[PDB]
Design an enzyme around this catalytic site. Structure first.
Site, PDB file in Angstrom:
ATOM      1  N   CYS B 108       0.839  -1.171   0.000  1.00 38.61           N
ATOM      2  CA  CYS B 108       0.000   0.000   0.000  1.00 38.61           C
ATOM      3  C   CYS B 108       0.874   1.221   0.000  1.00 38.61           C
ATOM      4  O   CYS B 108       1.584   1.401   0.959  1.00 38.61           O
ATOM      5  CB  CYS B 108      -0.890   0.064   1.278  1.00 38.61           C
ATOM      6  SG  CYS B 108      -1.826   1.671   1.397  1.00 38.61           S
ATOM      7  N   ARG B 111       0.401   4.634   2.956  1.00 44.63           N
ATOM      8  CA  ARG B 111       0.465   4.373   4.402  1.00 44.63           C
ATOM      9  C   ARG B 111       0.890   5.541   5.246  1.00 44.63           C
ATOM     10  O   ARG B 111       0.841   5.462   6.475  1.00 44.63           O
ATOM     11  CB  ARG B 111       1.376   3.174   4.692  1.00 44.63           C
ATOM     12  CG  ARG B 111       0.665   1.848   4.376  1.00 44.63           C
ATOM     13  CD  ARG B 111       1.651   0.677   4.631  1.00 44.63           C
ATOM     14  NE  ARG B 111       2.537   0.465   3.485  1.00 44.63           N
ATOM     15  CZ  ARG B 111       3.642  -0.261   3.540  1.00 44.63           C
ATOM     16  NH1 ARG B 111       3.966  -0.844   4.683  1.00 44.63           N
ATOM     17  NH2 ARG B 111       4.420  -0.416   2.466  1.00 44.63           N
ATOM     18  N   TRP B 280      -8.803   6.835  -0.557  1.00 39.65           N
ATOM     19  CA  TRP B 280      -9.094   7.627  -1.753  1.00 39.65           C
ATOM     20  C   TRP B 280      -8.106   7.187  -2.771  1.00 39.65           C
ATOM     21  O   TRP B 280      -7.080   6.594  -2.438  1.00 39.65           O
ATOM     22  CB  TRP B 280      -8.950   9.142  -1.518  1.00 39.65           C
ATOM     23  CG  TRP B 280      -7.644   9.604  -0.901  1.00 39.65           C
ATOM     24  CD1 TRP B 280      -6.432   9.784  -1.529  1.00 39.65           C
ATOM     25  CD2 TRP B 280      -7.447   9.969   0.463  1.00 39.65           C
ATOM     26  NE1 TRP B 280      -5.493  10.217  -0.616  1.00 39.65           N
ATOM     27  CE2 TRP B 280      -6.087  10.325   0.615  1.00 39.65           C
ATOM     28  CE3 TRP B 280      -8.278   9.971   1.592  1.00 39.65           C
ATOM     29  CZ2 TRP B 280      -5.558  10.766   1.844  1.00 39.65           C
ATOM     30  CZ3 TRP B 280      -7.738  10.410   2.827  1.00 39.65           C
ATOM     31  CH2 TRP B 280      -6.408  10.796   2.929  1.00 39.65           C
ATOM     32  N   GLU B 285      -4.830   4.344 -10.793  1.00 40.56           N
ATOM     33  CA  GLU B 285      -5.660   3.143 -10.621  1.00 40.56           C
ATOM     34  C   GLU B 285      -6.807   3.150 -11.648  1.00 40.56           C
ATOM     35  O   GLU B 285      -7.079   2.151 -12.324  1.00 40.56           O
ATOM     36  CB  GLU B 285      -6.207   3.039  -9.174  1.00 40.56           C
ATOM     37  CG  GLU B 285      -5.144   3.079  -8.069  1.00 40.56           C
ATOM     38  CD  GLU B 285      -5.722   2.970  -6.638  1.00 40.56           C
ATOM     39  OE1 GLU B 285      -6.199   1.874  -6.268  1.00 40.56           O
ATOM     40  OE2 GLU B 285      -5.677   3.960  -5.877  1.00 40.56           O
TER      41      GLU B 285
HETATM   42  C1  HEM Z   1      -5.779   7.021   2.069  1.00 40.69           C
HETATM   43  C2  HEM Z   1      -5.626   6.803   0.769  1.00 40.69           C
HETATM   44  C3  HEM Z   1      -5.005   5.501   0.236  1.00 40.69           C
HETATM   45  C4  HEM Z   1      -4.271   5.425  -0.884  1.00 40.69           C
HETATM   46  C5  HEM Z   1      -3.877   6.562  -1.862  1.00 40.69           C
HETATM   47  C6  HEM Z   1      -3.897   4.041  -1.067  1.00 40.69           C
HETATM   48  C7  HEM Z   1      -3.144   3.559  -2.112  1.00 40.69           C
HETATM   49  C8  HEM Z   1      -3.095   2.237  -2.482  1.00 40.69           C
HETATM   50  C9  HEM Z   1      -2.779   1.698  -3.795  1.00 40.69           C
HETATM   51  C10 HEM Z   1      -2.492   2.477  -5.103  1.00 40.69           C
HETATM   52  C11 HEM Z   1      -2.770   0.382  -3.671  1.00 40.69           C
HETATM   53  C12 HEM Z   1      -2.535  -0.629  -4.791  1.00 40.69           C
HETATM   54  C13 HEM Z   1      -3.970  -0.975  -5.104  1.00 40.69           C
HETATM   55  C14 HEM Z   1      -4.090  -1.693  -6.401  1.00 40.69           C
HETATM   56  O1  HEM Z   1      -3.184  -1.570  -7.263  1.00 40.69           O
HETATM   57  O2  HEM Z   1      -5.107  -2.397  -6.531  1.00 40.69           O
HETATM   58  C15 HEM Z   1      -3.089   0.007  -2.327  1.00 40.69           C
HETATM   59  C16 HEM Z   1      -3.171  -1.310  -1.888  1.00 40.69           C
HETATM   60  C17 HEM Z   1      -3.589  -1.708  -0.636  1.00 40.69           C
HETATM   61  N1  HEM Z   1      -3.912  -0.869   0.409  1.00 40.69           N
HETATM   62 FE1  HEM Z   1      -3.996   1.269   0.310  1.00 40.69          FE
HETATM   63  N2  HEM Z   1      -4.334   3.318   0.035  1.00 40.69           N
HETATM   64  C18 HEM Z   1      -5.094   4.168   0.815  1.00 40.69           C
HETATM   65  C19 HEM Z   1      -5.778   3.730   1.920  1.00 40.69           C
HETATM   66  C20 HEM Z   1      -5.772   2.412   2.436  1.00 40.69           C
HETATM   67  C21 HEM Z   1      -6.455   2.026   3.660  1.00 40.69           C
HETATM   68  C22 HEM Z   1      -7.384   2.974   4.489  1.00 40.69           C
HETATM   69  C23 HEM Z   1      -6.149   0.729   3.893  1.00 40.69           C
HETATM   70  C24 HEM Z   1      -6.611  -0.192   5.048  1.00 40.69           C
HETATM   71  C25 HEM Z   1      -7.289   0.289   6.083  1.00 40.69           C
HETATM   72  C26 HEM Z   1      -5.301   0.233   2.813  1.00 40.69           C
HETATM   73  C27 HEM Z   1      -4.757  -1.042   2.709  1.00 40.69           C
HETATM   74  C28 HEM Z   1      -4.314  -1.598   1.520  1.00 40.69           C
HETATM   75  C29 HEM Z   1      -4.150  -2.986   1.282  1.00 40.69           C
HETATM   76  C30 HEM Z   1      -4.427  -4.118   2.322  1.00 40.69           C
HETATM   77  C31 HEM Z   1      -3.662  -3.066  -0.162  1.00 40.69           C
HETATM   78  C32 HEM Z   1      -3.357  -4.322  -0.963  1.00 40.69           C
HETATM   79  C33 HEM Z   1      -4.759  -4.717  -1.437  1.00 40.69           C
HETATM   80  C34 HEM Z   1      -4.749  -5.971  -2.278  1.00 40.69           C
HETATM   81  O3  HEM Z   1      -3.928  -6.897  -2.002  1.00 40.69           O
HETATM   82  O4  HEM Z   1      -5.559  -5.998  -3.230  1.00 40.69           O
HETATM   83  N3  HEM Z   1      -5.035   1.299   1.990  1.00 40.69           N
HETATM   84  N4  HEM Z   1      -3.190   1.175  -1.605  1.00 40.69           N
HETATM   85  C1  LIG Z   2      -5.697 -11.833  -7.246  1.00 44.95           C
HETATM   86  C2  LIG Z   2      -5.709 -10.555  -6.414  1.00 44.95           C
HETATM   87  C3  LIG Z   2      -4.942 -10.438  -5.212  1.00 44.95           C
HETATM   88  C4  LIG Z   2      -4.964  -9.305  -4.422  1.00 44.95           C
HETATM   89  N1  LIG Z   2      -4.215  -9.172  -3.236  1.00 44.95           N
HETATM   90  N2  LIG Z   2      -5.744  -8.281  -4.863  1.00 44.95           N
HETATM   91  C5  LIG Z   2      -6.476  -8.337  -6.007  1.00 44.95           C
HETATM   92  C6  LIG Z   2      -7.272  -7.098  -6.355  1.00 44.95           C
HETATM   93  C7  LIG Z   2      -6.635  -6.415  -7.571  1.00 44.95           C
HETATM   94  C8  LIG Z   2      -5.184  -5.976  -7.368  1.00 44.95           C
HETATM   95  N3  LIG Z   2      -5.094  -4.691  -8.069  1.00 44.95           N
HETATM   96  C9  LIG Z   2      -6.323  -4.302  -8.711  1.00 44.95           C
HETATM   97  C10 LIG Z   2      -7.385  -5.164  -8.018  1.00 44.95           C
HETATM   98  O1  LIG Z   2      -7.918  -4.528  -6.841  1.00 44.95           O
HETATM   99  C11 LIG Z   2      -8.518  -3.256  -7.086  1.00 44.95           C
HETATM  100  C12 LIG Z   2      -8.826  -2.622  -5.724  1.00 44.95           C
HETATM  101  N4  LIG Z   2      -7.705  -1.814  -5.260  1.00 44.95           N
HETATM  102  C13 LIG Z   2      -8.008  -0.655  -4.475  1.00 44.95           C
HETATM  103  C14 LIG Z   2      -6.795  -0.204  -3.685  1.00 44.95           C
HETATM  104  F1  LIG Z   2      -6.307  -1.145  -2.787  1.00 44.95           F
HETATM  105  C15 LIG Z   2      -7.129   0.998  -2.902  1.00 44.95           C
HETATM  106  C16 LIG Z   2      -6.738   2.268  -3.338  1.00 44.95           C
HETATM  107  C17 LIG Z   2      -7.031   3.372  -2.569  1.00 44.95           C
HETATM  108  C18 LIG Z   2      -7.711   3.179  -1.368  1.00 44.95           C
HETATM  109  C19 LIG Z   2      -8.109   1.909  -0.943  1.00 44.95           C
HETATM  110  F2  LIG Z   2      -8.788   1.704   0.198  1.00 44.95           F
HETATM  111  C20 LIG Z   2      -7.815   0.806  -1.708  1.00 44.95           C
HETATM  112  C21 LIG Z   2      -6.509  -9.484  -6.834  1.00 44.95           C
END
Ligand code: HEM
Ligand SMILES: Cc1cc(N)nc(C[C@@H]2CNC[C@@H]2OCCNC[C@H](F)c2cccc(F)c2)c1
Ligand code: HEM
Ligand SMILES: Cc1cc(N)nc(C[C@@H]2CNC[C@@H]2OCCNC[C@H](F)c2cccc(F)c2)c1
Ligand SMILES: C[C@H](O)[C@H](O)[C@H]1CNc2nc(N)[nH]c(=O)c2N1
Ligand SMILES: C[C@H](O)[C@H](O)[C@H]1CNc2nc(N)[nH]c(=O)c2N1
Ligand SMILES: [Zn+2]
Lengths: 411, 409
Positions: B108, B111, B280, B285
């Site tokens: 993420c 953070r 947000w 994305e």
């Molecule tokens: C405040 C604004 C935030 C921004 C700009 C942000 C940004 C991002 C981005 C760009 C990713 C990659 C997502 C993707 O490519 O699908 C991500 C992943 C992730 N974020 Fe954040 N984040 C924010 C808030 C949060 C919050 C509030 C949480 C948890 C409470 C969080 C937990 C995670 C987790 C667990 C992932 C990996 C998700 C997955 O495996 O699909 N993020 N973040």
């Molecule tokens: C197979 C698999 C594994 C894994 N960990 N995750 C996925 C979701 C995919 C990863 N990449 C695009 C899609 O998930 C899209 C959702 N991503 C939103 C992002 F994490 C985000 C941004 C800003 C704020 C916030 F709260 C959350 C698929």
């Protein structure tokens, strides 16, 4: 044991069995991944296994595994190792070894080309002057007036590690860098330290923005020696843009021949500490990294000024706009001059096809995603969506530290 | 065992000691790196060490490690596990746990924000209708008329695992996808399967391109039920370009609230299987991935054509040109409608700052480079040049398989 990789765009799933032939360590453990870390004297005892493993691979590849020729070569090498503590590769073995080290190079997007590699055998070289001649011939052959041909030149192997052949240059062709007393740099800030070594070695520096550096060549563990590559051998491309006519007046140019000269080649446990190799550029190498890295020529601002982009907020994506134009310019300039270059869309598409072919015929293709994905427009290239397994096969290319940190100066 | 990370742009070297506390396994071995692989109940005596490890880090955090009150809670939880086979977190422990799961989230980039997280405690919830109410309140709170605030809503913890709370949707707000008689896909091709499961369960699809999906909610291991989010709670943004008047004619929009709802929150060995969270967007994305991925809305070709670029050869970089303009348009549109968004330059610069704070204050920061580097313009962002160490710390968010694969009806 079978490992699967998925492509998330296509849903194609591939099975890797080749990782089972992996020897060396990755840097990673089940508790830490070091995938984004850039950097994560042998006995007879350790050498015969390595020789055997190699000769076994070579002989299966020519479908002679188990033959008399095979068994005789093992015994021959065995006896050379026991008596002289090392051994010499046959020419056929060296060629196959150099090709496979490229094949096995997991950070290289260009590997579809691996079986076309001109190998120059410079194991008869004894002096720096001899190295100079060998490297001139390489550059002329590889350049081929802009119709670039992959090549490698292989100088004698390490013996006691006191008599190493080395090219001190990290690439055969690169531009000087001059740190100014005001703290600014002239030319390429990546090359400041090396440029300073050249000068102190007696190089007469032009002090311009694109001065081709002199070769600095070490033969047989001796102090290195300066040579100037003949200018007529150094193909260069002035950079202009198809639409923007002010682009040319930025003064930019680049050299046509990317030629890595600081890596160590390992075949059959033998170590070639000087094995300069070359292919051709993927455009992003120059347009993204060399020109736009902050610590390199850093031209983004000046390009964006000239483009009259809104520069007050990063969110106008001005940096990204200027970046694309610079990369269009590099590709256009090379193409207009008939100097081989590949764009990042074409190169990655070719790599995916190479990678799939290798899985079918070889049971795998180690790849390092961190390096394979181009440094711009990552996700609109197919490699972004492709899962990869990174592991180490030999023959291999290895980074080795710059020789000025290790060399015992003879004076 | 003490590891260095170097930034190659700046030469700043940082020493990681935090990794020696890592618990879960990575997928990597000494022989093979799986850095690019997307995917690489507890008994009484499995749970106590997990609870202890957590409560120890908690009491250390409030600087009462080894204190009377520390030992007393460890005792209380021990008693509770031996007798009930699970335990309940104090509000304080839940809040700290959730903020830390985000802090430990190595994928993420945002953070820097991890400490400002509103936690909604939905552990008293018991039906799907209740889940719906909680989620609308989360949606409205976090949206805040475009001034977005980070939030999570935590539903009851797993018990025997035959009674899970699950949000079937992968995100709270997403668009439907349907395959056409013509053979292409209308709407989002990634949600085709989920949309079919919704219609199977009775949703009447508008059958358009940007239809907000319904929630499919599962309470207490029951068959999931359908709810529409109140349309007035879903803040959407029409996409226009500051210079290309024709851009609006593509008819593109996207939702303001990114809200992940398929993850599993693990705190002190307890498993919160429905824990929707939201922050947000970083513009890439939507603009790079949602709009430009070939198996998503895949709009590059159409934008490039409206731009009159040379689409005959890959080397004209028409894709690259169109990509940037699409991303300028996402950012501009969100900013014009006053909906919080961050560009990839600002986001990655903040994350470098966050890394540096974490290295000095905590001894490290797990980070997964493959996810952290934006999907466009990688090397002009500072994270491209930053070495990162990836490792798994607990509390954590973990991916769950889609439940239609699990559930029996
Ligand atoms: C405040 C604004 C935030 C921004 C700009 C942000 C940004 C991002 C981005 C760009 C990713 C990659 C997502 C993707 O490519 O699908 C991500 C992943 C992730 N974020 Fe954040 N984040 C924010 C808030 C949060 C919050 C509030 C949480 C948890 C409470 C969080 C937990 C995670 C987790 C667990 C992932 C990996 C998700 C997955 O495996 O699909 N993020 N973040
Ligand atoms: C197979 C698999 C594994 C894994 N960990 N995750 C996925 C979701 C995919 C990863 N990449 C695009 C899609 O998930 C899209 C959702 N991503 C939103 C992002 F994490 C985000 C941004 C800003 C704020 C916030 F709260 C959350 C698929
Ligand atoms: C023929 C066209 C070729 C293309 C387009 C190409 C492309 C590339 C690119 C873009 C990289 C990453 C470079 C960087 O970002 O610094 C790379 C790395 C590398 N390639 Fe190639 N390559 C080609 C030929 C070769 C040849 C001929 C060899 C050896 C015989 C080779 C061996 C390597 C190795 C060892 C690396 C890793 C370099 C390092 O660790 O610094 N490649 N290739
Ligand atoms: C620290 C460190 C480790 C390592 N293994 N490597 C480096 C060289 C860096 C990699 N990134 C920039 C610079 O290397 C620049 C040279 N790369 C040219 C490339 F390999 C190439 C392209 C086409 C044909 C060909 F023969 C060669 C540094
Ligand atoms: C820290 C990180 O590993 C480093 O910046 C890498 C990232 N990816 C790269 N990819 C290529 N092709 N060349 C490089 O120099 C790098 N640098
Ligand atoms: C195969 C590769 O791991 C996969 O495409 C990843 C690459 N990096 C990513 N990075 C982010 N932030 N989100 C993603 O969905 C992905 N996909
Ligand atoms: Zn790894």
């Amino acid at each position: 044991r079978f490992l699967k990789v998925k492509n998330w765009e296509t849903d194609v799933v591939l099975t890797d069995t080749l990782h089972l032939k992996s020897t060396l360590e990755t840097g990673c453990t089940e508790h830490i991944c070091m995938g984004s870390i850039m950097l994560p004297v042998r006995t007879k005892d350790q050498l015969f296994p390595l020789a055997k493993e190699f000769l076994d691979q070579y002989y299966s590849s020519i479908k002679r595994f188990g033959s008399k020729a095979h068994m005789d070569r093992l015994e021959e090498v065995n006896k050379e190792i026991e008596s002289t503590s090392t051994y010499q590769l046959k020419d056929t073995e060296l060629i196959y070894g150099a090709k496979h080290a490229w094949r096995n190079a997991s950070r290289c997007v260009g590997r579809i080309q691996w079986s076309k590699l001109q190998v120059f055998d410079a194991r008869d070289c004894t002096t720096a002057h001899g190295m100079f001649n060998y490297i001139c011939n390489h550059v002329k052959y590889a350049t081929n007036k802009g119709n670039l041909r992959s090549a490698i030149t292989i100088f004698p192997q390490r013996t006691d590690g006191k008599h190493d052949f080395r090219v001190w240059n990290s690439q055969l062709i690169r531009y000087a860098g001059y740190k100014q007393p005001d703290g600014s740099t002239l030319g390429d800030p990546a090359n400041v330290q090396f440029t300073e070594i050249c000068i102190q070695q007696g190089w007469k520096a032009p002090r311009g923005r694109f001065d081709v550096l002199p070769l600095l060549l070490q033969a047989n563990g001796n102090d290195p020696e300066l040579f100037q590559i003949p200018p007529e051998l150094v193909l260069e491309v002035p950079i202009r843009h198809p639409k923007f006519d002010w682009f040319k007046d930025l003064g930019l140019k680049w050299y046509g021949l990317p030629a890595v000269s600081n890596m160590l080649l390992e075949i059959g446990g033998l170590e070639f500490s000087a094995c300069p190799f070359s292919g051709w550029y993927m455009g992003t190498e120059i347009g993204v990294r060399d020109y736009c890295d902050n610590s390199r020529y850093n031209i983004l601002e000046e390009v964006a000024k000239k483009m009259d982009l809104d520069m007050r907020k990063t969110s106008s994506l001005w940096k990204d706009q200027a970046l694309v134009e610079i990369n269009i310019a590099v590709l256009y300039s090379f193409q207009s001059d008939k100097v081989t270059i590949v764009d990042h869309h074409s190169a990655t598409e070719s790599f995916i096809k190479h990678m799939e072919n290798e899985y079918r015929c070889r049971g795998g293709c180690p790849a390092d995603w961190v390096w394979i994905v181009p440094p711009m427009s990552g996700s609109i290239t197919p490699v972004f969506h492709q899962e990869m397994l990174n592991y180490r096969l030999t023959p291999s290319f290895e980074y080795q530290p710059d020789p000025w940190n290790t060399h015992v100066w003879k004076g």
